[PDB]
Amino acid sequence: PGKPEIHKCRSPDKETFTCWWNPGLPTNYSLTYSKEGEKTTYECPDYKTSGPNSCFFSKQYTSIWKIYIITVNATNQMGSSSSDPLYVDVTYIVEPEPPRNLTLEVKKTYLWVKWSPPTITMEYEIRLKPEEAEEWEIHFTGHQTQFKVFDLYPGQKYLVQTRCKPDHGYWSRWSQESSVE
C-alpha cells in the first residue's frame, strides 16, 4: 500500500509556488497536477530546486488564472496509490518574503523603526527582546511601514525582527535580527 499526504502549498510572490508532501520498502513519489477546463494531465516540472518532498512551479507553469487540482502518487509494487487531491488558487496561498530593509532610528528617548515590503494590502508585526531576556514582547503595527517603540532599558542591546501578511494569505518568515544601543 501507500498513503500520500499533502502538507502545504505556498507562493512567495504570486509568480511561483512550491508544494510539499508527507511520506507514508522502496518509496517512489511523483506529483501530477491538472487544470480546470481543458484537463491535460501532466507530471510535475521539477522537484529538485525546492529540495526534498517538494515540487517547484516556475513562472512558466504558474498562472493565477487557473485552479490547480494536485495529487501525489506513491508507486512501489503491491502498494501503489494516489493522494487526496488538493485544489489551489495561486493567490490564496501567499507566503511573502521577510520585509526588506529595516532601520533602527533612535532619538523622549525612543527607538524609531522603519522597513519596506517585499515584491512590488498587508499587515505587519514586529517583535523585540533585550537579549538579556530569552523571550519577545511583540507589537502589532497594522499597515504601517514604521513603528515608534517608546520605553526601553538604556545602554542595552536589542534584537528586532518583522513580519507581514497579505490581505488574503499566510504570514511570512521572521526577518533578519538587527541590534541597537
Binding site: 485552479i67 488558487d89 493567490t91
Partner: protein, 185 residues
Amino acid sequence: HPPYCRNQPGKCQIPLRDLFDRAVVLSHYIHNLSSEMFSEFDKRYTTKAINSCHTSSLATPEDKEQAQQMNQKDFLSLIVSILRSWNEPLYHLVTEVRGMQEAPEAILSKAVEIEEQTKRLLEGMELIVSQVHPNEIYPVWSGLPSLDEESRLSAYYNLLHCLRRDSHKIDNYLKLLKCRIIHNN
C-alpha cells in the same frame, strides 16, 4: 479546498469578485510602469507633434458620460480589442531596444516587465469575457518601419506616448466595470 468553493470542489470557477481584483491590479501596475518608462525616455532624450495613435479608429468612450452610457458587455470587447492591438508593438519595442540598438539607459528593464504583465493581463481578460459569453477584430499597428535619429526618436516617442495614453483608458475602464458590476456602491 479554496475559500470561495462549495457544493462541487470540481469545475469550481474563480468568482468574479476577485477575478477583477487581480485584473485591476495589473492594469494599474502596467500604466504606472509605462508611465515612468516614458518619463525616463523624455528626460533622457527629448519637441512633440503627435495626433496619431493606432487606437483612434475604435469607438472609445472619451468622457465620463459616454462611459456611463456604454454597455458593460461591449466594454470588455472594447478593453480586449486594445490589449490585443498592443501585443505586436510591445514585442518590437523589446526586441529593437534589446537587439541591434547598442543598448542605452535600461528603459529595457521596464519594457520587458510591461510585455509580460500585458499578456498576463490579456488572458485574465479572455477569462472574464468567457464568463459572460456573447472575440472580434482589432486595429492594426503600422508604424513598423518607423521603429535618421531625429525621425526615429520621434517614432519611439509616439509609440511610448500612446502606451501611456491607452494603458490609462484600459486601467480606468476596469476601475469602472469592477465598480459597476461587483459593487455599484
